[PDB]
Symmetry: D2
């Protein structure tokens, strides 16, 4: 029947991820946000504390956990700082294409080193001209003998200048008439090969400690043994990846929303106005209630989406719903938390202005709020005929 | 482990309820809404179909179903007509106070009689001067011999004019500072007793075939044997009830929303404007997506609150979140369903305007949206 | 300079409409909502009290008033019952096409008799298969000598079976490739002419006492003397009628909204729960404040739309904003008004459940919420190019 | 009657501030934001152009303008940067207390020096333990002979470390049971006085170039001739000031919102996805339309609030609504302007992310969002008794 209970093993990872978040990530989050420095120390702890590369099949050294677990751990991380969390989750995002679109050797080779040493990887789809419109990417790949020459630009790549290797999507069919399901190719490209030119670190409003940047691929030579499933199967792999990784993303948002809620509540029991605590004012009580309600509902949506794909079924529908809802309520709670703090909440000495800045990104990456509505609409309507 | 899978027994109960709603409730819900006559026929078919009193334990002829099971059946019902469905649920609301508060006799006596024949009971707590402030009711009760003389009135009682027996909250202690947790007493009262003056059928905006009205009690006499757990445990029996009834009530609102969503979606795939199908205009697509999203979230919220109580764990927190949310998105989905229909949506010859009129009630009874907030804040600032 | 002051004369019109609405309309609107009976008695009294046909030029016996004036009166009327008000304001809608699109003769004939006798007229554009898309209408008009043969059907026509004459829009050019600006013609059709088959009174959830029904035109022969400006200038006239007529509609929703606010406001100061008036519960205070806020803002927007057209400038941008907003908040206050009444609110013995039923239509007729956004988006974006 | 036409004079002011704003503020706004450096060059410049101290009576060298005028000017300014505009507007805030509560001598002395040289002043009410609850301030003032000894702490003071003179609200009656309308007194304090300790500069999320800080007052001696109207008239002077300064703060929000709307529009007319310009996608056009709708309504509201006070009528009701609404729609428009920009919108190399960090303050200062509801609710209930 129905069950919202956790296995004893899951309650274990959760306790571990939680401790690590409230004891290690939280005391340093404020400083990494200010200095925009890559959180190398924290990424190593998470590595030896088994909180990273969770999805890598144990057939290569991984724990072989499932999307339910990734979300479970990720929510505890995001609670500390989604900046560190995004860098961590970026690894899963880049690995997944290999897990569902790669052969044994490719996984043994690129996934195996991830469990052996604390390396990082990245997902390369987005370009300057196209992001939401994946079908419009212009980065190319031509075959020369047993190789592929790759030329193009990638923009906004997470872990972009810190990855050992990259998952790269490039158009292989020059014919403009070529359909999306046959014009692209997923390649696994090592970062040190001659031709990849890493750009500068972009400076964004939130998740500052995270490394995000552009990359130029100029006459990059990739050996044929590096094409994932085959020339022309890149798009499906890309789509499959998003369904697998959108749930954990949505989980990151609820993690951020939780943080907002706890802060808002803690302060609401300390500050007094007109003779009573902020929480004793019905106005504020309803605000707090409406916040809690939303975090619970967003957590349910991602659990449902994770479970679905984990059970082996296509979860595009539930996945998008969770991403959309969690993203929107993550922002709503971020600003309401700042709100109950009054002037103090607008100040950097307090923890909430950072939350409002980190939150905006959830409505944009891994499919914007709009694109998610296009997906949900296309799946919902497909059911009526 | 995590699971959102229904058991074969539930995929069976559900198939039955869905059939009863799609094929039998839906082709007549329209006329019952217009006329407003208590849909006795449908209530007989529900009963003899197992879809009623679904909570009475086997020991008395009932199926002894759980809260999760009850919500799965309700959603399918409401999807047809929340008017008919509310008639049905008003039954388990009058029953639960007996299941959780009454002794074997009382239970065998009044619950057993419900499995033998298609009878109806009612829950009487609300009065004219108090609905939300449940601790403020005035219906009195004074003991005399092995009897309690009850005096007072109630209002908005569902199945009030169609009930065999009533669960009834009255104030036993006449002391002002009497601690709420000892000032009230619950009673299972029979409709045929002297002094029970039933009122006219109250006419409302939605859920019109349902029976709702005021009941005045004047010197009604109740034998101490009908006093539920004991003289004074009233407030506790009444409160403990909500923890079981709220989940189903939210699943009802979700069924309505599911119906509205379906109607609007089919129409959008039929009506054409500007050389395009309504569903092809990005503006409408987004509307549809947001509606889908809200239905799926409201559904999960009640499943969570049900599973919580079915597990023996107190579920006030999750229950109120499901009730609060489901009520809101049911009203929002009703108005948007009317919106996609256009002029037709505003018309009586179409199915959507009824939904909009029905929905509104979910924000009012069984604890208003405002009261649901007060509870969610109390429980949250409690964890 | 800026002024939100009413001229002494406008202060008079308002006081008339107000008294009329609160002493004569309110006392009987509930029965009319029930019976669905045309409110002839109230229309008669509205006519003599000078509250109707407000826009007809003095040249033809009218008050010569303007849109700002037309709105001030409507809001007061709507406060009583938008069912009655929509019946009255429908006359204005049907009259505008003549006032801005006809010659002296046409205006003397049809506009003139409205000042002498309490007749009613109607606006016939919407068909069963095309409403939001006026360029979609399929009722044709054919030139047979010095006459026009009209054939087609119209749906949802206010004052549809109570009108003396009708303004009708019919495609006059069969060429499917013909521009909408050149393919239509507006006519003036007298109801008694042979061929006009009036349908049944339609039953609706709200504004129940207003006459709204379908109408078929079977070989109706209208004289060229009744063509508005010319053959092919019908689309512009209608577009021009909406900008002029949309503001009063908005002012109409503001009336309904103001009514809801008062009812709820008067109850909240009466009903007591948990030992306090509803009003003393901050949760309800804030609720009331938001309603007040929305009504004030909606009132301001229709005033800005009336002034713009009254100053001789095309007011499309402003009319749409006012209509869209007033409609959205008129619906929001209806359900919140029912909400503060609680149980009673859902009962037909209390005035608010009717408000909720009447309100929904403001988001549909005279341009649906969605179309308003299209128009607004068109006006706004044109200013950057 | 009704008018929405600017007098030829206001059209001049407006055109000047617009020019100054789009060609002098905008070009350097991003830099002052990144450094948080106080914009002295722009302030001296504004003072030169007459876009400052606008409300000072002309018999003191001032323009003698009104609130509506201040709102017209502030909106243009805020459009360039609400960081720069807040520094300017904070001057009016500090001056009003003298305008409505000081005698002739005090005004020529303090308001006079402002017109002769580009000085700055501040408003001192908020303390660290009380902001919304003005009646809860602890700063004490006692009368010793012909002077008052001031002791207390203030916090979040705009222009706090750049003021020549301060308006200070202190409690002059130790009797805790004394009414709020009799326990405070407003003093005008010179910053160079012994005992005034300026705090460091506080670092906030938005309006970073604005100067804001706390200030300690150790036994600050103040001549009795510096008491504004008299002992105990402090609450009313402060309350009276907020009614006049609330419309302007609201106008600042609609300026920031207008800036958001323009950037969003211009980008939607350039960025291309799925073969069309963003503005071509209906989901996006609808968003732009709603954004446009709010700005027009927010602007309309502060216009109504300014006009009511210039006319010599208590405008508490209208001021709070305009302030409450503009505040919200500014935050809504900010985050949605970032949305249309995509990943770019989240990047600091673009103008929108700054607009989002700045907008959040409008729901906090000059009376928080919740406090405005308390006022609107009360004024509203007052109309039913
Ligand atoms: C915290 C963790 C770290 C994260 C750090 S940030 C990381 C990142 O941001 S990664 C970048 C994210 N990129 C996006 O979200 C892009 C959003 N766009 C899309 O998803 C799609 O282009 C779209 C808009 C949905 C689709 O557009 P279309 O071009 O129109 O494709 P279609 O025509 O719909 O379909 C073409 C074929 O693909 C098949 N398809 C579509 N969806 C799916 C799914 N979900 N699974 C499998 N196959 C799919 C479709 O069936 C078509 O196939 P045919 O066989 O030809 O019929
Ligand atoms: C599908 C449709 C079918 C048709 C259905 S029509 C049927 C109906 O509409 S229901 C009848 C109408 N009545 C209502 O809606 C009441 C709504 N509830 C409320 O508003 C309550 O005031 C409240 C807000 C919930 C509570 O307010 P309070 O006055 O402040 O009391 P509490 O503090 O909650 O409780 C005090 C004592 O109650 C006990 N308690 C509290 N929570 C619980 C739970 N969860 N389980 C059991 N007991 C509980 C508690 O023990 C307190 O007493 P003690 O002194 O500790 O013994
Ligand atoms: C009073 C209360 C009591 C009674 C209450 S109930 C009464 C009623 O319901 S009456 C029924 C109302 N019907 C509607 O609201 C329909 C809404 N749809 C529309 O407004 C238009 O189709 C549209 C969506 C705006 C336009 O769609 P399009 O087909 O795409 O036309 P466009 O391409 O935009 O324009 C084509 C030409 O028309 C000209 N045009 C458009 N707007 C105007 C205005 N405002 N003035 C002048 N001309 C206008 C446009 O310029 C085009 O022509 P050109 O050749 O370029 O000159
Ligand atoms: C763009 C510019 C650049 C700089 C930007 S940053 C600038 C700033 O931040 S300035 C600081 C802002 N702080 C605030 O806005 C705080 C909001 N709080 C309040 O307004 C009031 O405390 C309140 C909540 C409305 C009232 O609370 P109460 O304590 O409960 O007072 P009351 O008991 O309601 O009333 C007490 C007496 O005062 C009288 N009163 C109230 N309002 C008014 C007005 N508007 N005019 C005159 N008198 C007023 C009221 O009548 C009471 O009178 P009695 O004589 O005592 O009977
Ligand atoms: C911090 C950060 C980290 C990132 N990390 C990665 C990474 O690791 N790997 C990676 O591949 N990418 C990454 N990205 C890129 C991100 O996934 C893309 O930037 C985003 O999906 C790109 O879309 P766009 O910016 O082109 O937006 P566009 O959508 O093209 O334009 C902006 C607006 O257009 C709207 N829009 C577009 N098309 C439509 C339509 N048809 N209908 C309605 N609305 C529409 C969008 O909703 C949006 O609001 C990152 C971005 C950021 C900011
Ligand atoms: C950049 C900046 C510049 C400033 N400049 C100035 C200046 O020049 N002069 C000046 O005097 N002040 C200034 N301030 C201070 C501003 O006016 C105050 O910060 C604000 O009014 C302070 O409220 P608070 O921070 O104490 O909030 P508090 O309200 O005390 O606490 C936070 C929360 O409590 C809620 N709350 C409080 N009471 C109630 C109630 N009864 N009912 C419901 N909700 C309630 C609030 O809505 C809020 O969300 C500035 C602040 C900032 C951030
Ligand atoms: C169709 C229908 C069927 C019904 N069937 C039954 C039945 O079978 N049995 C039964 O017992 N009752 C029944 N009722 C009654 C329903 O349970 C009550 O109407 C509802 O709980 C009554 O509250 P009230 O109307 O007294 O509202 P009150 O709340 O007293 O007053 C109206 C408003 O006050 C607000 N409010 C009250 N207190 C507070 C507070 N402290 N803070 C903030 N806001 C507050 C509420 O949210 C509400 O909007 C039925 C009602 C309807 C409409
Ligand atoms: C009580 C009443 C009185 C009336 N009186 C009159 C009268 O006197 N004269 C008269 O002429 N008409 C009258 N009407 C008709 C009213 O003007 C029309 O019903 C309405 O404009 C018709 O549109 P539709 O119903 O065909 O809508 P349709 O648009 O066909 O369908 C409704 C849905 O489609 C959406 N939609 C359509 N096109 C698009 C698009 N391109 N993009 C996004 N969404 C879109 C709409 O927004 C809406 O939600 C009346 C209607 C009613 C209910």
């Amino acid at each position: 029947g129905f069950s919202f209970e956790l296995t004893e093993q899951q309650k274990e990872f959760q306790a571990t991820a939680r401790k690590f978040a409230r004891e290690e990530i939280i005391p340093v989050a404020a400083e990494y946000d200010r200095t925009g420095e890559y959180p190398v120390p924290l990424l190593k702890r998470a590595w030896e504390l088994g909180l990273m590369n969770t999805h890598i099949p144990e057939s290569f050294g991984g724990l072989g956990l499932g999307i339910i677990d990734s979300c479970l751990i990720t929510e505890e991380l995001a609670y500390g700082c989604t900046g560190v969390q995004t860098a961590i989750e970026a690894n899963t995002l880049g690995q997944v294409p290999l897990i569902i679109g790669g052969n044994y050797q490719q996984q043994k080779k690129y996934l195996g080193r991830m469990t052996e040493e604390p390396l990082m990887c990245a997902y390369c789809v987005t370009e300057p001209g196209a992001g939401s419109d994946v079908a419009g990417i212009k980065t190319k790949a031509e075959k020369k003998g047993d190789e592929y020459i790759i030329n193009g630009q990638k923009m906004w790549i997470t872990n972009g200048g810190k990855a050992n290797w990259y998952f790269l999507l490039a158009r292989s069919d020059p014919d403009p008439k070529a359909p999306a399901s046959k014009a692209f190719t997923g390649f696994i490209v090592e970062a040190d090969t001659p031709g990849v030119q890493i750009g500068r670190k972009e400076i964004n409003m939130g998740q500052r400690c995270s490394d995000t940047r552009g990359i130029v691929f100029e006459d990059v030579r990739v050996p044929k043994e590096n094409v994932l499933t085959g020339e022309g199967a890149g798009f499906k792999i890309a789509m499959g990846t998003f369904d697998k990784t959108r749930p954990p993303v949505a989980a990151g948002a609820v993690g951020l929303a939780q943080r907002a809620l706890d802060e808002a509540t803690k302060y609401a029991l300390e500050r007094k106005t007109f003779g009573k605590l902020l929480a004793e004012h019905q106005g504020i009580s309803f605000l707090l209630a409406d916040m809690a309600m939303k975090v619970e509902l967003a957590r349910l949506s991602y659990q449902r989406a994770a479970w679905e794909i984990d059970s082996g079924r296509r979860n595009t529908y539930y996945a998008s719903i969770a991403k959309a809802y969690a993203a929107d309520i993550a922002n709503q709670l971020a600003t309401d938390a700042v709100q109950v703090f009054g002037g103090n909440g607008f100040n950097t000495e307090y923890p909430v202005e950072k939350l409002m800045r980190d939150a905006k990104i959830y409505q944009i990456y891994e499919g914007t709020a709009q694109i998610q509505r296009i997906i949900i609409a296309r799946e919902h309507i497909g059911r009526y005929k």
